[PDB]
Design a protein around this ligand. Sequence first.
Ligand SMILES: Cc1ncc(COP(=O)(O)O)c(CN[C@@H](CC(=O)O)C(=O)O)c1O
Ligand SMILES: Cc1ncc(COP(=O)(O)O)c(CN[C@@H](CC(=O)O)C(=O)O)c1O
Lengths: 396, 396
Amino acid sequence: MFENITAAPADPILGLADLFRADERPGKINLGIGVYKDETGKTPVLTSVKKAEQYLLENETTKNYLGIDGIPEFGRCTQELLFGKGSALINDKRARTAQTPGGTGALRVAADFLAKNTSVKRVWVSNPSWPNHKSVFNSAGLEVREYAYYDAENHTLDFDALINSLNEAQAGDVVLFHGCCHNPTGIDPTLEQWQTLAQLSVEKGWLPLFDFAYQGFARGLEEDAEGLRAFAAMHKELIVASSYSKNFGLYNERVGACTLVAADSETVDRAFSQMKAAIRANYSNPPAHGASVVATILSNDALRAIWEQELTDMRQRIQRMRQLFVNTLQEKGANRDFSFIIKQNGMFSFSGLTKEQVLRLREEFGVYAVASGRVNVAGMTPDNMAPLCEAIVAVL
Amino acid sequence: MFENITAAPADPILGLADLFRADERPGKINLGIGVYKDETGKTPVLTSVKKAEQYLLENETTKNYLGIDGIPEFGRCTQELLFGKGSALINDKRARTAQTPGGTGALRVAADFLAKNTSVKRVWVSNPSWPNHKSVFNSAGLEVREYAYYDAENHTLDFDALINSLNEAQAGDVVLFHGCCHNPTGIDPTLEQWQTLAQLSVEKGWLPLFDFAYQGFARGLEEDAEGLRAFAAMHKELIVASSYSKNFGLYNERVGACTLVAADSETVDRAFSQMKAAIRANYSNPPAHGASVVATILSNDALRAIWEQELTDMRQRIQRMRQLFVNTLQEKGANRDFSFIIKQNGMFSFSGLTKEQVLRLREEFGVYAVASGRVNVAGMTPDNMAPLCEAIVAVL
Ligand SMILES: Cc1ncc(COP(=O)(O)O)c(CN[C@@H](CC(=O)O)C(=O)O)c1O
Ligand SMILES: Cc1ncc(COP(=O)(O)O)c(CN[C@@H](CC(=O)O)C(=O)O)c1O
């Protein structure tokens, strides 16, 4: 039965991890996966998290199944994070949240839901975008079309192109937007641009699907939700796939949410019963651990204050690494001018490196980046900044 | 876009929990969902589990992503549980295990894999079976056909009927078996019957798909895997969907495994690469907590010893409740004979109650059973036994 199955091509992102490990080169540097690192190059469990975990250990009396949609507090806290404490979506009860296994699981739950219960046939993703977007959607039977976004030469957001390409999108098409910290460009629309996009979408009849995985890594929790919020004031229907993987340093616990918004409470509820049916035929109900942690932290003033500070620290230090990279590149002989890098938000920078340059860095130098030239700035430290910057220079 | 969405019928199993969790009656009794309850009526976190969790809290230094297939030691530990220490399957490197979100997650991953990488079109499932089996397969695009199984008149396994029914299956078809503790009948084949079925299946060219969610609840760990091992000795290929939800009391942490077996290692490796691709487009990678627990416990001699005892205590208490049920029923002057119930294994009992009787039991008496008349014997207690038996007797 399996004799003729051919091997799958490795994951452009996840597969680097394989290589990196299997690599013996002593000074090897990993800038692949989007995982936060500290000054010492380790990915620590957050303090607020360890504390939340101690609490659960002492207070948990059962492992009894959660509901299909998971923990209620969890959904409630997510809605406030997303839409704002006294939002109308919340008061009007137009939103329903399901706790999912990571942001990926949320993306997938949305896909399965759309495919099975709506007339959606295609989803529009930016060029470039996170490679796994194609895969999740295709998996649900949806077609993926691309819209223009990035301007390589100017290293900017090509609004014109963005706008004309999206002109090919039909009413009833799903359009995927990155909440903040565009992966992999780091270029985000301004608020006016968000506002513009929000009207076109309403005028053109698209169904917005927001991929929100880096809330807090650009400017702040509330600031980062502006675009989304702009969309939320205008749209009747919305889908939000969010992740707590990065902002809580909870990568392997699979914590995310799929938020469903409709015109009214009765509608959203009916639609949501189908979303639950889709979850049930997938993984049945969500993993309690990680989401327990998040709800514990968000619902406790003290633990929360600590959390917000830890996130602020992650963010500023990435920012520090951005400036240091540019400078080091600078006085290490860079032919090119990498200063655009300072203007990107989040954990990565699109270096502008060729596929062959990345190949080489890896082969000759032990430096691991994604084929697309995406580098994980948050993987950079003062101790690895030099060797790394020499490598790059040697390949320009 | 969602205006036309129609509301999903509630889950026959999962939905009972809601009903149950909503009637304000004082002595209601939940016999629905398959969760273990102790003499006091609770589903405590196991001791071996709390212990492993403490270790984790103290020892974990990171929450960084696990590989797509999860924790290696977890998979290793699973294979031995399934196949036995020193199996050839193991020795020949014929099997690969992916850690998944529960048994449901593994059943679904197996479905997506089959549907995209093989020529499979139909899956044969017993009648009756767990109602979600249909939902899962159907969602991967596979057709579900049913084979005869239970003899309701006599309360036995209708072997010839089962065999004659399956003669309708084609080579290349997927046939699904319950490892032990058939849900919902509690009737399992004998070892000879298992052997028979194993030979046939090889001659007929079926792909065996095992759903193993109660290892340890019939007779014990090792003996509950006989059927499966009988199959594994004859077959070149097979798929195993296992769950650690019940035997570890880890319901909400979603812990299971999907094991793929092929003729050889080169072969099995190739197919596995495809199975990983299917995970990546679903949930990406699995939740660490629960599997970490299981592996810690299985890898530690002391912890293992304690766990195995907790498991035998669960099993024997159910056995006790089953005798008690039958007796009290008797002592309460029940119309029929309910002695077959003693011959069934696992957490449930196929009562023989009609739709309308289960329905009445609930409105009238607040006793909750699944519409098929399936009763959770593990939710039975010496304190709830009388009232419950009085309710049953009254509806008959
Ligand atoms: C834009 C985007 N969406 C969703 C996800 C998935 O989040 P969860 O891990 O919560 O499921 C990621 C993770 N992107 C990372 C890691 C990865 O691809 O696995 C990245 O390195 O791009 C992401 O970058
Ligand atoms: C035969 C069978 N297979 C797979 C599973 C799924 O197990 P996981 O919870 O590990 O995903 C169950 C759980 N059946 C229970 C619970 C349920 O239906 O949700 C039951 O009450 O039948 C089961 O009975």
